[PDB]
Amino acid sequence: IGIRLTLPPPKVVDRWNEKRAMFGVYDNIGILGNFEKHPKELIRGPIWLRGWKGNELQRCIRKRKMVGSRMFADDLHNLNKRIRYLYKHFNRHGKFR
Amino acid sequence: LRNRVTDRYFRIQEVLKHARHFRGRKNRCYRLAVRTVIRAF
């Protein structure tokens, strides 16, 4: 009974809308533009993970360091607690040691 | 619920089809039907 009795509404995807059509453009901005701009500068998103990657603990540490002062009170409390828990987990628990 | 199982009906049926000829709840309930079917095989 966890299965729907009717076909879901047809899903139409426009493979040639502007976003899909122009996806990937300027990814070679650096090599093809005298390296004036690094491709990582094309990444639009959270300030603390623009052209940067890491595990959950590293991401939380970076978030607190970069925007922690501008975070809401309860969100910052949650971030501090998550950092604490992730520290304990990564530094004290696991199969390999 | 990013990823959910949508085939569970067919996964249950693949076992119950071999238990339809059993007696009692072993021919209806998967928890029992699977055990009985494994024993039968």
Binding site: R4, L5, T6, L7, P8, K11 | L1, T6, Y9, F10
Partner: peptide, 26 residues
């Protein structure tokens, strides 16, 4: 509702099979 189409399609085919068995065509 669970997102997906292939399980629903399989169930529709099985429902068609059951309907045919219950009401065989002339």
């Amino acid at each position: 509702v669970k997102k997906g189409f292939r399980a629903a399609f399989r169930f529709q085919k099985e429902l068609e099979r059951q309907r045919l068995l219950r009401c065989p065509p002339p």
